[PDB]
Ligand binder design. Structure first.
Ligand SMILES: Nc1ncnc2c1ncn2[C@@H]1O[C@H](COP(=O)(O)OP(=O)(O)OP(=O)(O)O)[C@@H](O)[C@H]1O
Ligand SMILES: Nc1ncnc2c1ncn2[C@@H]1O[C@H](COP(=O)(O)OP(=O)(O)OP(=O)(O)O)[C@@H](O)[C@H]1O
Ligand SMILES: Nc1ncnc2c1ncn2[C@@H]1O[C@H](COP(=O)(O)OP(=O)(O)OP(=O)(O)O)[C@@H](O)[C@H]1O
Ligand SMILES: Nc1ncnc2c1ncn2[C@@H]1O[C@H](COP(=O)(O)OP(=O)(O)OP(=O)(O)O)[C@@H](O)[C@H]1O
Ligand SMILES: Nc1ncnc2c1ncn2[C@@H]1O[C@H](COP(=O)(O)OP(=O)(O)OP(=O)(O)O)[C@@H](O)[C@H]1O
Ligand SMILES: Nc1ncnc2c1ncn2[C@@H]1O[C@H](COP(=O)(O)OP(=O)(O)OP(=O)(O)O)[C@@H](O)[C@H]1O
Ligand SMILES: [Mg+2]
Ligand SMILES: [Mg+2]
Ligand SMILES: [Mg+2]
Ligand SMILES: [Mg+2]
Ligand SMILES: [Mg+2]
Ligand SMILES: [Mg+2]
Lengths: 484, 484, 484
């Protein structure tokens, strides 16, 4: 209701939305995690993005890594730090110990380490101080309830100087105490916790802001992924899209399905195709993708069960010839497996492919095939992220979800994601005269009349040939027609 | 049965109902919690609300935060503390250690700290002493079973002075021991525990009063929220409402549904609409909201599965034109997501919107969409709180709950919240001649005759056109009619 | 098989049945618990009830609380201890330490504490010694396996003097070791453990006697409640009732239901009404309660999902006018919530209301509404307690249990409490011609013929008008009749 504290931007994607603007100006920030979770990378990215964008110099204090190894590690990410060192914009301070030395004094070097930082700030005019692996000096020969005074005097001095500070501390566990001694949380005004929790022989990185004194933030754990461009925090917000399309509709690919949907799906929506296995869902996906060749539009395909060669053979058995659209740069196939990578990296891969190719239609084959190992909440998060990222860029997406109970059941989606989609097409098996025929049904719509009827369809050598109706039977969806 | 001890009001909303009047007068109170849970904010709010309301001065003792940082943090909440310091109403005593000093004596400073506090009490005529972060002096260089005497002499001399005291202690765990040494619970006469427990990658703040010597309170854990106005504890009590409305009823929006319900729902009730997905629940919500434009009444809409445009386009496809009601200040759309914030914060958001807009009808779309990740007890608490806040302010509320098992099932609500609502409307699918039609049914009412029949309806380009009946069929609810 | 040891009564209500007569005479008793569970209150009540009833003087030993604070705390319960101190019947000895003193000797003061107790016993002729917070002297500066000798010499000396002793020890956990050092259990001949275990954000107090050397007791945990009159333990025993009523019956309220049950329920029984929601259970409860106005009898009503004014509005919509019975002191309404207090306290509230009002009929609306959060064993204990306490005072009780599966189901009660009740009335939904009609059925009886038939009824503007039968249908209970 009144004025708030000032805070400066770290320019990391996703993090500036979690903390409502960035780290506070003047205070410190504790970034604590297990080994191999991204504590050092956070500090280096926080320095580099501030140097490049706002021309704000910063220093980097080291305690167990030599500067040239840090530059060598950072070179693989793309950014060059030696050039910025030569330009006088970045200064890696070296406090790593000589392997040959003396140990006559335990930890009474902080009073000189402060001055070693302070003069360097006064010659480089730095703004972002970033002490890394600070838990190697104040705890080298000290026990508990002694490091409290050292951390207090350090944070108080960096507040007296008036620069943004980021610290780094190690952990022993994943869900236990936040730091090694359980006392560093009550000193730093900002606590950020990185986790690398392992469940079901799969790793998953998460970020959490525990406490921000004086301001507000997001409470809970938010996943991230260490890609080739650094930390990529995935946010949760879809207030950007303020547009809809009641105007001209894109074609489905089957003229009968367009007639049954009223003239096209929509320009942007989420189409869900469901049913049992062997019913014809991949045919619907292939007809949805191949239609982009008619209007010279770009559409790509995600495969999670098949593999390229088999997809081309099945397409040529239907008369599709995907090599022509592949050669015309109107088609791309990813052809990955659900267990090759974790579920969180699949969203980043899809986002990267969508950004690079810039397509108009996305078809994710077998959305339930990558929903087996993971729990319900992670799959719901993945589905919500995919649907939001497709909806905010006016892309017509079609998904596919096979069911376990093959003959007449209920609960159309076992993962309960039918409420996010816009259109639902119901495929099923209909036992007619002991020959196991199949039928189609437009279950629901979000803006047109959608032809409330049940249509028998077959699979010919060209495509889906939809027949008239089941008008002289009873209880069709239960897999047991009784003619009357 | 006899006279009780006196107690004074902290003027924090929610807390004065839990403790039956406030903290006791003369004794102390221990507020222990994990880092980042609201221990300091409780003390500052307890001082400020007592200064503003009853003109009672108070002191604030600090041990690890400088006074100007505390004033800067408190400025973001709206209240100014520097002005009250200049007015002589508040005194922040400073006992934080100088970073450059001496450590010849561990913690033998309480005999001077009592005099330092008492001299300020005698010069400011304070009533509310509030020692914060007390677990940094008596335990700075002391082991277990030694801090017992220090806390005992602290509480004894603060009771000899005779003022209300609030203490602050840290924790290491969430469900383990109450304090850091497991001994401070047996000294303080009042123990309040703050928790920040994490489950399902979501945080949830709770408050609990463990023991009040001499009086009664509420036993258990009660949730709270740190909003922009401080700690806002949600209580549990609905004895305020002593009014009912057997008189004039508000219209539903559909004249056929009003005829089927007997002339309107009621002035105040809880309407529940249920069924499977794609059945027409959002149409019922839209017709319930749009009817407020006829009588120049204010009504708002909560959306948890759509987003503005998706709602405006669907409304214009039915002939509603929500932009006119938005411009005439008779409609507001929230358009949030269930996973954006936790379930605990949604109740506060709804309460704030209801208080600010002052509407007459509330429509919460998809009450089951925010009941997925959370457990049953939390969702029941949320539903009970929403219904109580709607009922105590004579507001006609309509909710929406989709079911998982889409065809013929039982157990109308999977979360078993059917005993809180007042009206239940049953929407379902009816497989007729293999065209999959839909039907309506007023399942129950709480004061009218409500037309016990099953009516087929369709969705036209204007609204719901309800047809006559299913009089020549059988077992309609089971999703498989057999005509006779 | 032979003579047993003598034991004297503590006159605590509930405790004298668990321990088969009270604490043994001459020995000691250890009462150990967590902070805030009722250890001190047990000692004070044990002294007070022995002073008032048998005129037996007793002493109270303090180690961390001053006597005037103890008197101030005990004054809130109703009893005054200052007058008893002035009468020379009670002596609170003060051994609390001066905040200003010396610590040259750790804990070698027990040899003087023995004489200080012994002189007081010889000056007041006391019988009940009660040492409170004894775990502050022998463990103040002592380690493990050292307090064994101190506790041994203390218990041996109090046995040599020959007086009943009650001790108090603290805990750290809830289900771990019994005492702080795990050694005090093997010294005291009697061990009583108090627990304050927390589950589902709800507290629940239990009492357990671990060991009584030489005699017998009850094994397990027994719940208790700290009310305004002290500790009030609920026991488990129903050997008091030796009466039954095959004679004159009380009316149900509906003359058709009395004819269908054979002329009235009984003078004392347990009536259960079940079915789905919206079926007419509250109407049956209201007709059962309102009938007491005809014979000038007193009956009360418990509501757990209504709101007083709503009950009056629904009653006036049926033609009942509860305000006349409220003004004539023949009606009382509680109007509470199931989540306002725990299930443990609801039995105490019902017992207090029954004792104060002295009614003839009890009607607890929605017995399943307060059976959601709790487990099955706690709800079974609550039902058994309510039914036993209603049966032992010849009170005709009627209950209400809604089912989750609304359509044709089985297992009439999901909590399996159908075997406790005496009569069961089956309410259900019967789909007739697609209009969803309702029907009644007296499922079982315990002493009359009860008219084995299924009767359709409706709800008119006056009351339940029961129609003839379903004699031309089949499979009525399964919710889908087929006429033949
Ligand atoms: N080019 C890269 N692409 C993808 N992941 C990378 C790349 N370079 C490094 N990583 C990953 O980043 C992590 C390295 O993090 P970083 O070295 O910055 O800190 P840390 O290992 O968590 O800290 P500490 O040095 O204290 O153990 C590892 O998980 C590593 O696999
Ligand atoms: N040339 C063909 N002639 C006849 N039927 C064919 C031909 N090619 C494929 N089919 C039919 O296609 C079906 C195989 O399933 P399809 O590849 O269409 O995928 P889907 O069932 O939609 O899903 P998924 O691939 O995930 O199982 C079978 O019913 C098979 O008979
Ligand atoms: N304006 C605000 N709006 C919302 N939440 C806020 C605001 N200001 C602070 N908070 C929250 O309040 C908490 C800060 O609590 P406070 O600093 O009073 O004590 P604490 O952090 O629990 O104690 P300690 O300093 O001992 O760790 C954090 O969770 C922070 O996110
Ligand atoms: N212009 C239209 N013409 C015909 N039918 C329409 C039109 N707009 C919407 N519908 C129908 O509305 C239904 C979509 O559901 P609706 O938006 O009414 O919400 P709901 O089923 O009550 O709930 P939810 O949005 O949670 O799924 C479909 O049956 C669809 O055919
Ligand atoms: N008048 C009262 N009505 C209801 N409950 C009360 C009343 N007075 C006290 N209590 C409750 O009784 C308990 C106090 O117990 P008591 O002070 O006798 O011992 P204790 O707190 O368990 O022991 P210790 O002081 O060693 O921690 C608390 O739970 C308090 O809420
Ligand atoms: N004035 C009235 N006219 C017609 N029917 C009424 C009237 N008042 C109530 N009803 C009927 O009463 C039923 C509502 O349930 P009722 O209040 O009788 O409680 P219940 O079903 O026994 O249980 P509960 O209240 O626990 O759900 C509906 O069937 C409704 O039609
Ligand atoms: Mg590192
Ligand atoms: Mg496939
Ligand atoms: Mg604090
Ligand atoms: Mg909807
Ligand atoms: Mg006590
Ligand atoms: Mg009822």
């Amino acid at each position: 209701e009144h004025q708030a504290i000032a805070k400066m931007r770290t320019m990391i994607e996703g993090f500036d939305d979690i903390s409502h603007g960035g780290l506070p100006i003047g205070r410190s920030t504790l970034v604590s995690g297990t080994s191999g979770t991204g504590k050092t990378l956070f500090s280096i990215q926080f320095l580099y993005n501030g140097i490049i964008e706002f021309d704000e110099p910063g220093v980097f204090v080291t305690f167990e890594e030599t500067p040239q190894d840090i530059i060598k590690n950072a070179r693989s990410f793309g950014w060059d730090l030696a050039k910025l060192v030569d330009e006088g914009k970045l200064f890696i301070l070296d406090a790593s110990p000589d392997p040959e030395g003396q140990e006559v004094v335990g930890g009474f070097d902080l009073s000189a380490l402060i001055e070693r930082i302070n003069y360097a700030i006064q010659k480089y005019r730095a703004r972002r101080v970033s002490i890394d692996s600070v838990t190697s000096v104040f705890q080298q020969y000290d026990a508990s309830s002694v490091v409290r005074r050292e951390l207090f005097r350090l944070v108080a001095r960096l507040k007296q100087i008036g620069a943004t500070t980021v610290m780094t501390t190690e952990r022993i566990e994943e869900y236990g105490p936040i730091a090694r001694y359980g006392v560093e949380e009550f000193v730093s005004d900002n606590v950020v916790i990185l986790r690398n929790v392992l469940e079901g022989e799969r790793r998953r990185r998460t970020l959490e802001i525990l406490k921000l004194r004086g301001t507000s933030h997001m409470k809970g754990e938010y996943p991230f992924t260490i890609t080739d461009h650094g930390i990529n925090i995935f946010p949760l917000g879809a207030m950007r899209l303020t547009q809809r399309s009641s105007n001209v509709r894109v074609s489905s690919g089957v003229v009968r399905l367009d007639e049954m949907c009223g003239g096209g799906f929509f320009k942007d929506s989420i189409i869900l195709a469901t049913g049992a296995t062997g019913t014809g869902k991949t045919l619907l996906v292939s007809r949805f993708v191949e239609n982009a060749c008619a209007n010279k539009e770009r559409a790509i395909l995600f495969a999670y069960e098949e593999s390229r060669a088999q997809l081309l053979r099945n397409a040529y058995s239907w008369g599709m010839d995907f090599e022509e659209m592949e050669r015309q740069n109107l088609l791309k196939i990813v052809c990955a497996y659900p267990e090759s990578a974790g579920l969180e990296d699949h969203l980043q891969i899809i986002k990267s492919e969508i950004n690079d190719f810039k397509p108009a239609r996305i078809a994710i084959d077998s959305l339930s095939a990558l929903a087996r190992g993971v729990s319900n909440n992670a799959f719901r998060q993945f589905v919500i992220g995919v649907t939001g990222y497709a909806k905010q860029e006016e892309i017509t997406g079609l998904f596919t979800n096979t069911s376990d109970q093959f003959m007449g059941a209920h609960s159309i989606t076992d993962s309960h994601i039918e409420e996010i989609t816009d259109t639902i097409i119901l495929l099923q098996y209909v036992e007619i005269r002991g020959e196991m025929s199949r039928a189609i049904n437009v279950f629901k719509m979000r803006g047109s009349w959608h032809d409330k009827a049940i249509r028998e369809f077959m699979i010919s050598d060209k495509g889906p040939d939809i027949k008239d109706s089941f008008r002289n039977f009873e209880r069709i969806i239960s897999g047991s027609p009784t003619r009357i």
